[PDB]
Amino acid sequence: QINVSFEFFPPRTSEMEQTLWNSIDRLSSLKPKFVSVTYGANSGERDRTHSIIKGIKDRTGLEAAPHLTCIDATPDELRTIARDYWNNGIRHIVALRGDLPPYASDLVTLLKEVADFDISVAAYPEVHPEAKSAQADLLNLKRKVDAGANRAITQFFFDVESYLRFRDRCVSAGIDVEIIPGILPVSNFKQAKKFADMTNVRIPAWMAQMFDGLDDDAETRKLVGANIAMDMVKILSREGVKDFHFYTLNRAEMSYAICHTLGVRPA
Amino acid sequence: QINVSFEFFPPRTSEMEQTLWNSIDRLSSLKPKFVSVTYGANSGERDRTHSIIKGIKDRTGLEAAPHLTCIDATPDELRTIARDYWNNGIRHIVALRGDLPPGSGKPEMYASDLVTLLKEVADFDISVAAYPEVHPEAKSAQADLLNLKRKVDAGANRAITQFFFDVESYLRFRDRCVSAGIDVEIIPGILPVSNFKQAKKFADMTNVRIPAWMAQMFDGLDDDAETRKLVGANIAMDMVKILSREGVKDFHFYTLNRAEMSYAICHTLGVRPA
Amino acid sequence: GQINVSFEFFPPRTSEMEQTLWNSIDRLSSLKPKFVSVTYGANSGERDRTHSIIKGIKDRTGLEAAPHLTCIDATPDELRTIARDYWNNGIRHIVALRGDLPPGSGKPEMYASDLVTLLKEVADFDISVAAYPEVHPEAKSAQADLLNLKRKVDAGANRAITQFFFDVESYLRFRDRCVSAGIDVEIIPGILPVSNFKQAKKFADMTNVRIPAWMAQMFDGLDDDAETRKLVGANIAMDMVKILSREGVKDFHFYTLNRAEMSYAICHTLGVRPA
Ligand SMILES: Cc1cc2nc3c(=O)[nH]c(=O)nc-3n(C[C@H](O)[C@H](O)[C@H](O)COP(=O)(O)OP(=O)(O)OC[C@H]3O[C@@H](n4cnc5c(N)ncnc54)[C@H](O)[C@@H]3O)c2cc1C
Ligand SMILES: Cc1cc2nc3c(=O)[nH]c(=O)nc-3n(C[C@H](O)[C@H](O)[C@H](O)COP(=O)(O)OP(=O)(O)OC[C@H]3O[C@@H](n4cnc5c(N)ncnc54)[C@H](O)[C@@H]3O)c2cc1C
Ligand SMILES: Cc1cc2nc3c(=O)[nH]c(=O)nc-3n(C[C@H](O)[C@H](O)[C@H](O)COP(=O)(O)OP(=O)(O)OC[C@H]3O[C@@H](n4cnc5c(N)ncnc54)[C@H](O)[C@@H]3O)c2cc1C
Ligand SMILES: [Hg+2]
Ligand SMILES: [Hg+2]
Ligand SMILES: [Hg+2]
């Protein structure tokens, strides 16, 4: 069967707060394998990440996986955060290094020492913008797995071939874990392009065309974005992929629809 | 060169207050590397610790090191206290877990956690407790030794030992610290004994063994304070002499707010006024 | 006073050995040992005897009895059943060992740390494990063996009991290396009082334990002299135990070989007497 997960982020406004909880309720009915909440380098927000995971696990009963970054934190602190999480029933965590202020493998090992955690790590089909080469980054992923990562969630992508080729290189390199694709339903192209430029993610020429001229047409953008996303998962699904991780951005509709086309429906 | 330090406790009464300041004036002339003040569980020995430290600093200009306990303090309260000290020129703190009151027994925060917390605030000089005869609540002698290394690794500059009457206890313990990689000065704590009945009470509750020969020395002197002072001073002076011959260059005296005995012992140690 | 002692007995193989054992237990019980333990053999009969002697000790003396348990010839499920039964019967302290590998057809895949883990899953037992000041014969390195000890302690072991030794420096350096590896349990020295030297040499040869030249000299020529051997062996044991105590050791485990006199006397010099 198809397993899906949804990724949310801590809301920064009263409106965004309500929007989030509505989407959480709406998406819980699809029974995802788990849901994750992002974490950014900000003490108060770090507290917010905690509270949201707790609230989720407490009102839906779904498995909630918090993101944790190696950046700006001492090993003893990280260990206490881990023990505090495990103690609160939160046995799944997404281990990352973190966006640097103007390593991951170590955080994996750190967490495994504390407890037999279910760890998820980041994979880069188009190479992390910092690694010196495709191979170096590929080997790093392997290290993170060897350290104890159960799953590998990729950064969003638009070129299906880039992902399929990467997935092959992973197995060819001995990585025995699933490379769960990260899907970004695009409704705002302008914003998507900004994200891609940062993450080194390539936006194919054809996609640029699809959004050309839709700047003021919010409705058409959602229609075109959903179409593009549904095509993606259709191909990925036929190619053997049975696990999808959605970057909801606290919005339910597009992911809900895409899930419906995958057969992921309420029951 | 021999270095010394003296430990005082917050006076609860007017008479005790006077004795303390007299001792401070007497002992200050020896120019000790530092002087420290106890931090108990009650406000009497808690609020006062701060006052006495300010007093000492103003009246003599000697480095005063306050003792700090995490017992009934939130990490927030501890940081507040640490910032105040640092900002006011206090660069040395004696970080301790603290004597938990026999009632509630919660294995939560430990001294190493306090050390870490203090180092997050500023580059303090932290002194921690060491036990040559093992801390009475330790899992084992090895665990207690590992705890000392943990505190040194957390940022402790030096270790001050609990008092002892068997010089060999100190000597073996120091050898173990070195073999274990603990690279800081293991300052022996010296308790000049004037009253034996009171010394037995302290050692009893501290797991410190009192040799039979020492109990023999004070036997029959229950009402002879003058002879107890002479005998006790003799015992301390000999212990201190042995330790020096063995390489110890730093001593920490538990004055109990009384200056006479500690002053005399320091004199024979060669540490005298200018 | 502040010194704890424990005695180790093995299941007797004859009627004569049995009378000797119970006698030793009666005599040694007066010293109020922290606990007594009983060895675990490989054959079915022995293993049953271990259980009965532990029961006999518990009833007859009311002392804390700790049986040994190995991985040899047992499925994880047999082991759990045995452990559950032990716990329900009041015996809540086990000496967990992998066990002496028999010269037959069976490669070791399960080790002592695995047994500790399995035992911990059953109940909160007090678990004691084996330590080797002179390195276990099969260890590929002293580092491996020491890290293995840490592994067993991490799994749940409350204390370590070392293989016997004749060179105190070996115990002392090992006690130090244990701290350097982060092992936080007290390593209790295993004391083997020797009266029969040839037999002691046998045990040593097969355990990678070194007998100092001076010690061999001490027993040279005393083969047919049981009396002298007992005095010489007691003197040696007493000196070693004396040095250990001056070095801080306050816990001792005696390999009695079911005999009481030597361990009794050595205990007496430590100050552990009947009251
Ligand atoms: C599913 C997902 C979720 C994310 N969630 C968050 C989040 O909640 N918060 C957040 O801040 N960020 C998040 N990110 C972004 C991520 O933290 C950044 O891309 C960051 O730069 C890398 O984190 P990482 O775990 O991939 O780092 P790493 O795996 O450590 O790799 C990062 C870089 O280091 C390199 N590398 C690794 N080890 C070595 C080494 N020893 N020597 C040299 N180079 C080395 C790699 O090749 C690469 O260039 C997420 C990413 C993904 C895909
Ligand atoms: C120089 C000196 C000055 C002192 N001054 C004072 C004072 O001003 N005020 C006061 O109240 N008391 C004072 N004390 C006494 C001290 O607070 C008590 O001895 C207290 O019981 C332990 O303090 P500690 O700092 O040694 O704690 P710790 O170093 O934390 O050790 C306490 C115990 O816990 C164990 N332990 C440590 N970590 C762990 C762990 N993770 N798990 C389990 N066990 C662990 C240790 O082995 C030890 O048994 C002083 C002691 C000395 C020697
Ligand atoms: C106090 C004491 C009591 C004893 N009582 C008995 C008894 O009642 N019955 C009995 O049959 N025997 C007994 N013995 C002997 C003991 O069983 C043997 O010495 C045995 O060969 C190992 O037991 P162990 O528990 O040390 O094994 P372990 O701790 O598992 O180690 C045995 C060997 O395996 C190695 N090792 C550990 N883990 C691994 C790994 N994962 N991969 C590779 N090598 C590894 C160790 O380094 C060592 O060389 C006793 C020994 C002692 C010291
Ligand atoms: Hg980091
Ligand atoms: Hg505390
Ligand atoms: Hg086994």
Is B151 one of the annotated binding-site residues?
A: yes
Q: Cβ C184–B141 below 8 Å, yes or no?
A: no
| Residues of chain C positioned with their CB less than 8 A from the CB of B143 | 184-185
- Which helix (H) or strand (E) covers residue C258, if one does? none
- The answer, for B181 touching chain C at a CB cutoff of 8 Å, is yes
| Residues of chain B positioned with their CB less than 8 A from the CB of C185 | 139-140, 142-143
Distance from the C32 Cα atom to the nearest Cα atom in chain B, whole angstroms = 21
Tokens of residue C183, six digits: 């092992």
- Are 3 or more Cβ–Cβ pairs between A and C shorter than 8 Å? no
Alpha carbon of C108 to those of B139, C105, C138: distances in Å? 33, 10, 11
Find, among C32, C94, C99, C42, the residue nearest to C68 by Cα.
C94
Q: Please report the DSSP string for B190-251 in residue order.
A: E---S-HHHHHHHHHHHT----HHHHHHTTT-TT-HHHHHHHHHHHHHHHHHHHHHTT--EE
Task: Phi first, then psi: give them for residue C52, nearest 5 degrees.
Answer: -65, -40
| Residues of chain B positioned with their CB less than 8 A from the CB of C175 | 142
Q: Which of B179, B204, B206, B209 best tests the C interface by mutation, with the highest count of C CBs <10 A? A: B179
Closest CA in chain B for residue C1: B209
Contacting residues for B138 by C-beta, under 8 A, at least 6 apart: B131, B144, B147
Specify the 3-state DSSP secondary structure of A228. Answer: helix
Angstrom distance (rounded) from CA A19 to CA A258 = 19
Contacting residues for A197 by C-beta, under 8 A, at least 6 apart: none
| Cα of A264 from ligand 1 centre, angstroms | 30
Specify the 3-state DSSP secondary structure of A83. Answer: helix
In the Cβ-directed half-sphere of C176, how many Cα atoms lie within 13 Å?
17
Q: Cβ C184–B142 below 8 Å, yes or no?
A: yes
Distance from the C263 Cα atom to the nearest Cα atom in chain B, whole angstroms = 25
Catalytic residue among A7, A15, A45, A178: A7
Angstrom distance (rounded) from CA A20 to CA A8 = 8
Calculated CA dihedral for residues C139, C142, C144, C145, nearest 10 degrees? 60
β C159-164/A64-69 pair status: unpaired
Q: Measured between alpha carbons, how far apart are the two ends of chain C, in Å?
A: 11
User: Is C169 an annotated catalytic residue?
Assistant: no
Closest CA in chain B for residue C250: B141
CB-CB contact of B75 with B117 (8 Å): yes
Q: Which of C2, C184, C188 best tests the B interface by mutation, with the highest count of B CBs <10 A? A: C184
Is B162 one of the annotated binding-site residues?
A: yes
Please name the member of C175, C184, C246 whose beta carbon is closest to the beta carbon of B143: C184
- The answer, for C178 touching chain B at a CB cutoff of 8 Å, is yes
Residue numbers in the known binding site of C for NADH are 39, 163
**Which atom of ligand 1 is least distant from the CA of A141?**
29
Tokens of residue B107, six digits: 């294995």
**CA-angle at C246, arms to B254 and C187, nearest 5°:** 100
Tokens of residue C30, six digits: 């007066």
Let me know how long chain C is.
275
Name the DSSP letter for residue C84: H
Distance from the C156 Cα atom to the nearest Cα atom in chain B, whole angstroms = 14
| Cα of B23 from ligand 5 centre, angstroms | 31
**Which atom of ligand 1 is least distant from the CA of A130?**
49
In the Cβ-directed half-sphere of C185, how many Cα atoms lie within 13 Å?
23
Residue with the two structure tokens 């204390």 = C159
Domains and their CATH numbers in chain B: 1-274 (3.20.20.220)
Residue type, C133: P
Q: What is the resolution of this structure in A?
A: 2.5
The 10 Å Cβ neighbour count of residue A128 is 17
Calculated CA dihedral for residues B58, B59, B61, B66, nearest 10 degrees? -70
Inter-chain CB pairs, B–C, below 8 Å: 34
Q: How far is CA B255 from the centre of its chain?
A: 9
CB-CB contact of C91 with C54 (8 Å): yes
Angstrom distance (rounded) from CA B250 to CA B185 = 8
| Cα of C47 from ligand 3 centre, angstroms | 18
Angstrom distance (rounded) from CA A230 to CA A155 = 18
B5 lines ligand 2 (CB under 6 A): no
**Ligand nearest to the Cα of A68, by number:** 1
Distance from the C252 Cα atom to the nearest Cα atom in chain B, whole angstroms = 14
**Which residue of C136, C170, C203, C257 sits with most ligand 3 atoms within 8 Å of its CB, as the best mutation to test the pocket?**
C136
| Residues of chain C positioned with their CB less than 8 A from the CB of B139 | 184-185
| Cα of A137 from ligand 1 centre, angstroms | 10
Residues of B208-240 as b/e, b for ≥16 C-beta within 10 angstroms? Answer: bbbeeebeebbeebeeeeeebbebbbebbbebb
| Cα of C204 from ligand 6 centre, angstroms | 23
| Cα of B116 from ligand 5 centre, angstroms | 12
| Residues of chain B positioned with their CB less than 8 A from the CB of C176 | 176, 179-180
Distance from the C16 Cα atom to the nearest Cα atom in chain B, whole angstroms = 40
**Ligand nearest to the Cα of C115, by number:** 6
B231 lines ligand 2 (CB under 6 A): no
Residue type, A50: H
Q: Please report the DSSP string for chain B in residue order.
A: --EEEEEE----SHHHHHHHHHHHHHHHTT--SEEEE---SSTHHHHHHHHHHHHHHHHH---EEEEEE-TT--HHHHHHHHHHHHHTT--EEEEE-----TT-------HHHHHHHHHHH---EEEEEE-TT--TT-S-HHHHHHHHHHHHHTTEEEEEEEE-S-HHHHHHHHHHHHHTT--SEEEEEE---S-HHHHHHHHHHHT----HHHHHHTTT-TT-HHHHHHHHHHHHHHHHHHHHHTT--EEEEE-TT--HHHHHHHHHHT----
- The answer, for B167 touching chain C at a CB cutoff of 8 Å, is no
